[PDB]
Every structure is written in structure tokens, then in C-alpha cells.
Design a protein around this ligand. Structure first.
Ligand SMILES: Brc1c(Br)c(Br)c2[nH]nnc2c1Br
Length: 327
């Protein structure tokens, strides 16, 4: 068994209504107040548009939900309402429906995002510290609210680099944490999946998000994006093990008595744990410091229990320059 080191019982200590999303009854407003102006993208579950509220000229983002079990809509809506006002969490402005078709949509505050592929190649050392600190605020907040995001990745971290605004978006995979609950491991993008997911360990917690965070930090300070670039879920764990080491993986599996899919036997090979300094070269040296590597080493660990919490990460000396500037 395993449980979170922080906020483990927080949902059990709240009213059932807080976490019992199947019982939640959203108030669905009228989508006709919104004029769609540009398609921003599309996923399995939704289509996203930039829009204008015609009643007050507010620019927003509208996510129109594709056919799904209502349970998942209720989950995302209840999570977003529980996270209301949370630091650097995308603001849900309203839950609306087409008044005729009854197709639901979520209305979010607009962020003028800088494409991450471009942004990440121009970040300074301070920029990385700043944005990572701001992202950690969002994760600490949602964890404190009993919620795992489960899809942390660059595409889900909107950054307006001109106004220095960051928002964690795309809460459709997020769940409530309950001790001892077994969760679906089919969450997160491949490159950001924690080892626990890749070895089919279902008793995971908020610390999954801290692995994904760590992957982002590595990509930023080392300028290798994504940092662990697997070709499929099996290869993803191999890519991790080539850095963190295979004997170290087996120690993790043994501690938690994790059964390893035997297809891994033919592909993991034998790999030493690598020094993080091995990733430094002239193109990234100005982004890497002893403090950055110490932090990264404490995030990208197999053992989910031993990863820093979001709060512990925010307390790390790597962020002292940001704290100073904010004070
Ligand atoms: Br919510 C949201 C917001 Br806000 C912005 Br901006 C987006 N850009 N692409 N996809 C986006 C989503 Br989903």
C-alpha cells in the first residue's frame, strides 16, 4: 500500500458533497451569449474556441464538450468549482449549454499564450525559476484541495510571457484523491507519465503531478523538450531507466511489490544511474545551477513517496531569487 504524504485525508474531512461529483448538479447558462471567433484546437473530448461574450465584450475561451458520460463532465465541473479562485488555476467563468441542442460547454478566462516550443528556447534562468514557482503554486493549491491534475505538460500550462501570467488548464483528467483508492493509470501524456503509471501501479497520488513537473523542469533547464521522449509506454520507461538507472527501478518495484509486465524484460537492458551534470553543455549551461540540479534530483525519483511535495519544492533554495523579488 501507499498514500500521499500531504493532504491524504483532506477529502474525507470535508462534506461528502465536496467530492461526490456524481451528485453535483451544475447550473447551465446560455451559450448564445458567446460569439465564436477562432478555433484554437480539438481533442478527443472537446473543441476549443476563442470567443467574445456579446453582452460585455469579454474575450474568453469556450470548450465545447463532445459526447461523453455525464459523469466525466460533472467531475470536471465540480473540480473547477472547488478550485475557484485558486492561484494560477484557469478561471472557469461559466458552464453553459446550447439552449436547443443542450450540448454543454465550459467558458474560461482568455490567456494570450506564447507557444511553448518557441518560449522554451528563449527562457532565462530567472524565467524558469519564476514560471516553475508559479506552476507550483497551482499544484500546491489543487493538491491542498484534494485534487490530482494528472495531465501536467507544457501544452496544459498557458503562459503569457508579455504579462507574465501562467495558468494550469485542462482539468478533464483530474480526480479527487482518496487514500487507498486505485486509479486508472491511463492518464497524462506519454512523455510526462510517472513510472508508477508505466508499471501499472494504481495506488498513486498527487506525487504523480510532481513527476510531470520534474519532466518540465528538466526540459527547460537542459533544453531537451520533451526530456524523456519515448516511442510508446514501454519505451517511455526505458528512456527513464537510461537516466535513473535499472537497479534503482527494481528497488522501487520491490518496495511497493509492483508486478512488472514481462515485456519489459527484453527492452530495459542494464543502465547505471546517470549524473544530472551529464546533460550540461554549452547551449544550456547558463540555465543550470547546483540548486536546479538538487531540486530536479528530488522530483525525478522513481519512488513517488520520496518526491518533493509541491510545497517542499517551492521551499527549495532554487526559488529563493523568485521569493525575494515577490517580497
Ligand atoms: Br482553457 C484554454 C485556454 Br484559456 C487557452 Br488560451 C487555450 N489555447 N489553446 N487551448 C486552450 C485552452 Br483548452
Amino acid at each position: 500500500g501507499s498514500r500521499a504524504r500531504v493532504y491524504a485525508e483532506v477529502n474525507s474531512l470535508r462534506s461528502r458533497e465536496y467530492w461526490d461529483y456524481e451528485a453535483h448538479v451544475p447550473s447551465w447558462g446560455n451559450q448564445d451569449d458567446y460569439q465564436l471567433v477562432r478555433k484554437l484546437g480539438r481533442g478527443k473530448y472537446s473543441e476549443v474556441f476563442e470567443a467574445i461574450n456579446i453582452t460585455n465584450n469579454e474575450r474568453v475561451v469556450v470548450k465545447i464538450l463532445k459526447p461523453v458520460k455525464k459523469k466525466k463532465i460533472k467531475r470536471e465541473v465540480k473540480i473547477l468549482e472547488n478550485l475557484r479562485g485558486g492561484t494560477n488555476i484557469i478561471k472557469l467563468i461559466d458552464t453553459v449549454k446550447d439552449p436547443v441542442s443542450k450540448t454543454p460547454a465550459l467558458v474560461f478566462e482568455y490567456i494570450n499564450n506564447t507557444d511553448f516550443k518557441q518560449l522554451y528556447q528563449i527562457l532565462t534562468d530567472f524565467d524558469i525559476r519564476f514560471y516553475m514557482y508559479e506552476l507550483l503554486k497551482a499544484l500546491d493549491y489543487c493538491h491542498s484541495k484534494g485534487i490530482m491534475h494528472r495531465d501536467v505538460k507544457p501544452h496544459n500550462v498557458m503562459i503569457d510571457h508579455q504579462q507574465k501570467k501562467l495558468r494550469l488548464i485542462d482539468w478533464g483528467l483530474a480526480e479527487f484523491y482518496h487514500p487507498a483508492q486505485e486509479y486508472n493509470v491511463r492518464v497524462a501524456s506519454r512523455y510526462f507519465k510517472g513510472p508508477e503509471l508505466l508499471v501499472d501501479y494504481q495506488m498513486y497520488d498527487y506525487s504523480l503531478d510532481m513527476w510531470s513537473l520534474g519532466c518540465m523542469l528538466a526540459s527547460m533547464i537542459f533544453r531537451r523538450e520533451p526530456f524523456f521522449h519515448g516511442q510508446d509506454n514501454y519505451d517511455q520507461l526505458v528512456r527513464i531507466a537510461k537516466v535513473l538507472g535499472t537497479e534503482e527501478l527494481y528497488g522501487y518495484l520491490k518496495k511497493y511489490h509492483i508486478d512488472l509486465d514481462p515485456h519489459f524484460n527484453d527492452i530495459l537492458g542494464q543502465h547505471s544511474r546517470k549524473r544530472w551534470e551529464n546533460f550540461i553543455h554549452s547551449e544550456n549551461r547558463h540555465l543550470v545551477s547546483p540548486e536546479a540540479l538538487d531540486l530536479l534530483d528530488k522530483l525525478l525519483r522513481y519512488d513517488h513517496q520520496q518526491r518533493l511535495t509541491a510545497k517542499e519544492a517551492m521551499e527549495h533554495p532554487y526559488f529563493y531569487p523568485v521569493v525575494k523579488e515577490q517580497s
